Amino acid sequence: DLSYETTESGDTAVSEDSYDKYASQNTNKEYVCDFTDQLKPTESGPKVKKCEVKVNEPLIKVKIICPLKGSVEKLYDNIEYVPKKSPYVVLTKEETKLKEKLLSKLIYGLLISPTVNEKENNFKEGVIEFTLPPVVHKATVFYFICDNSKTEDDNKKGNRGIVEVYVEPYGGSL
Amino acid sequence: EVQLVENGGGLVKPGGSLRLSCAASGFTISSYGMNWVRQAPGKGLEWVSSISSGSTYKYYSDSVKGRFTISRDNAKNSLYLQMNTLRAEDTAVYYCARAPEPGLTWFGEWGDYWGQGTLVTVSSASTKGPSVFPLAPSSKSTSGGTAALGCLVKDYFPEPVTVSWNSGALTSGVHTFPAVLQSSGLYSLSSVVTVPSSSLGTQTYICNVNHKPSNTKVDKKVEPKSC
Amino acid sequence: EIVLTQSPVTLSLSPGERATLSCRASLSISSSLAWYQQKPGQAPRLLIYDASNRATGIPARFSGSGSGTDFTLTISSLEPEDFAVYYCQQRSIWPPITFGQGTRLEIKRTVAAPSVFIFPPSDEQLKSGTASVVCLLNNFYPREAKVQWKVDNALQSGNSQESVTEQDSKDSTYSLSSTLTLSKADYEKHKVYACEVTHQGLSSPVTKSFNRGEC
Amino acid sequence: QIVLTQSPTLMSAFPGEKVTMTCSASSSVSYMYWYQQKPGSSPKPWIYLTSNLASGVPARFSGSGSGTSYSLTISSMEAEDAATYYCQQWNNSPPTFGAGTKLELKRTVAAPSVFIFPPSDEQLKSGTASVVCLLNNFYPREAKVQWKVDNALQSGNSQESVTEQDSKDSTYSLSSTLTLSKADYEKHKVYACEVTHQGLSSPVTKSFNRGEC
Amino acid sequence: DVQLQESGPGLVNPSQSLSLTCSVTGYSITSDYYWNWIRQFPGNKLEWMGYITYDGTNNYNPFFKNRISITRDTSQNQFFLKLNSVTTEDTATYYCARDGRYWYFDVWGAGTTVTVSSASTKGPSVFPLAPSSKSTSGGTAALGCLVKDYFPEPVTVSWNSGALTSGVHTFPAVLQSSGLYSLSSVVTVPSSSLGTQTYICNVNHKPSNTKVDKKVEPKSC
What we know:
The structure holds five protein chains of five kinds.
Chain A: E1 20-23, E2 25-27, E3 30-34, E4 48-55, E5 61-65, E6 80-82, E7 89-93, E8 98-102, H1 103-106, E9 127-131, E10 140-147, E11 152-153, E12 156-157, E13 160-167
Parallel strand pairs in A: 1-4, 3-5, 4-13
Antiparallel strand pairs in A: 2-3, 5-9, 6-10, 7-8, 10-13, 11-12
Chain B: E1 3-7, E2 18-25, E3 33-39, E4 46-51, E5 58-60, E6 68-73, E7 78-83, E8 92-99, E9 118-120, E10 131-135, E11 147-156, E12 162-165, E13 174-176, E14 180-181, E15 187-195, E16 205-211, E17 216-222
Antiparallel strand pairs in B: 1-2, 2-7, 3-4, 3-8, 4-5, 6-7, 8-9, 10-11, 11-15, 12-16, 13-15, 14-15, 16-17
Chain D: E1 4-7, E2 10-13, E3 19-25, E4 32-37, E5 43-48, E6 52-53, E7 61-66, E8 69-74, E9 84-89, E10 96-97, E11 101-105, E12 113-117, H1 121-125, E13 128-138, E14 143-149, E15 158-162, E16 172-181, E17 190-197, E18 204-209
Parallel strand pairs in D: 2-11
Antiparallel strand pairs in D: 1-3, 3-8, 4-5, 4-9, 5-6, 7-8, 9-10, 9-11, 12-13, 13-16, 14-17, 15-16, 17-18
Subunit structure (chain A): Heterodimer; heterodimerizes with PF45/48.
Function (chain A): Gametocyte surface protein required for male/female gamete fusion. Also required for male gamete exflagellation and interaction with host erythrocytes.
Organism (chain A): Plasmodium falciparum (isolate 3D7)
């Protein structure tokens, strides 16, 4: 029962549909977005790395890895994970705007462990992780955003990362 | 058994266009990302392009984007590259490589199998057959069986050539040097052999050259001079 | 663009020895490095994927290692089939995916002095209107050899182009070709042409001479 | 339709003894659920998400497994834990159930008491004669009951009924009803009931005479 | 705590429609849960039949083909099972259950036996069984009563209207060739104290709406 009227554009960086687009790394039933290296600063202009997690099976676990503030010297000094309360709070697209929604009301049946490994299931600890339910009734797409563009080192700015999770319906009988 | 075969390479004058094909045999392409790498003559490998299964995600180098388009037929087991507005910088051997499916993290056995190579030459110089001029061992009249002789292949375009000795019966002590690019833009190389110097009259030496552009076969005899 | 620099640029080593190859990254990539062999005029071949896992059917002497910036391919005991050019490649930060520039493995031989031959232009070559005088160095180790063309005891530059063969499979030596390209209007206006070879197995630099017309 | 094959179909354990029950899914499921049904009650839910236990469940109970193999282990068998256990998946719709593993409590002491009941006079006025033979406080469940009418065997005119396990003493009761009409009943006088049971010292014959007894 | 209930049509003849009501109290049927129906075949497997959500969305077992409806009355906190074209195999004990926390069945109702037969509902007959003693009595005696010819099952059998709670011995029903069910109930007593309690055999048959009370008095053997 906790949400706010955050408004995000999907990209505060100037790049628009010239995003570098990639799918998740789907091993067995684990679909993984791993922003450890693709967000550290290389080119001087920030660019946008989008990670697309398309799901139409029961019990797909989704793991998203964003690097923490200062886990390496100088490289991720100004990361922003939005939504902060995520995986419990996700973003959905509201007319070319991204606004917070509660994930448990969005997809019923969603399995969220309180500790992702032993550490708490929150981007504070640097990985979030959730398992999609056996029945998903309406097609749902939701967003997680992790941003390294504020970080600057050696006159190079880090990249901006978006996860889009697209769930098609399954389990339905109608 | 497991093969990747490219065809389609050629000599196109610059600003020309060319379609390159990679046909796989022995495995299904559909679970694999497919790539193109080029290698200019005398340098390392340089990535050209990558495509996902189906074609949902395709990716290019900065120097080829806009000019080149990548595509794939899973049912034909084929990868294709469309190369337009070519430059002399694009002259290279072009290899395709199988990979695991691309991701944000492309962790796997990338380049598990590679293509044979196809040569794409981009130059204005029109295809010319070689000229073969002999280099005689008459100056090398030293006793003890030490003589070197050869023939010079000059002013041909584009590469390759084959230089064989005695229609293939002299392989030992034979050195065929790599071709070098001249200021004209054509090519020159030479072939040499060390023989015993007592064999210069009785044994006689043919320089058989085939240049596969323009169907050019020249066999020239290498004979000693007066001093 | 992560730039991957590979050291040493050429490594010389006798067979049966440990061979360590170093790949250095611009910005601490996360162990996505692959290691490839390439032989002369041939397709590349995958040796080590994911920086430490060897590929299927690659021998057990090939062992990849390292982290972050510094990665290392170790070939634990050399064989003659191990002598080739080697390439690292990252895929941690991409597109583009980037390679190294290469490292050669030659074979270490006992030092071989070149066999020096000088070759006059043919008369048919003179009638085509161009004149190439050829200097040949055969079956020498190591690859580095200095060749100077002297025309009537005077040093001439820029008319020469050269090429070197690959290593022999049993002699483990190389050969060298140097072409002096001139015109007939410039060739027939001189007398004596010479080759000067400076090499390690030579004790004093070997000159091979040629007199025009008569011999 | 994921097929959950639960083994064993039936089992008997002493109190204190460790019991493991298995459930074999016909394909890969990510989590197994488990329920206990006592007879005459709801299936209370016992194990959720393969490991977690719903509250109201003792800590001796455990669930475990992966893939196609799942199991339920009790470290200490108690009297209260004697019921039937179902597995359930919901890896994919529809959720299926296993057939159950029936768990019993084992007591060596058997004190069977056999009591005999003739048909009522009101029943005989109704044109019917049902004779009741009763077996009380016995274990195991196997007991053969045979009816004799003037020393003659009966060929499929009697039907019997077995109770479930009593919670007080873990013993059983059994009834045998001989359903008859009136004209074949009142033409014989002496009737006998035959009990062959493993816990008896000799097979118990019990008789009565019609009308006078 | 949420409590569920199931309604009471015990007999449907075949080729008729079957309707059942699950009544909920203590929690609103339109907040946050999924609301299932589960059958139990006789002494046998469970078949998950269906659910209706908080939202109203339906999800059914695909073995039933466009023949069942699960619907809801939100103002009465009720949800309804509608199985059309019933057969004799459709005889089962039916349960409603609120969803578990995620994808199991936490809170269950009490359940309703629904027998499906092409037959007439008939009331029971109670015949007395007295402690006429033979050998090996044990110093104690047992008495009882027999219920015959009732249709359909269940009945509730009590001794002295519930004022005898100790010693629970009621036999499960057996079906005769007539198609009418029969059972019996027994109590164990001390043999020298037969005229202290007045043993009443109290039987209620809830489909045929029968109340039978019979006294058990000893005989002269």
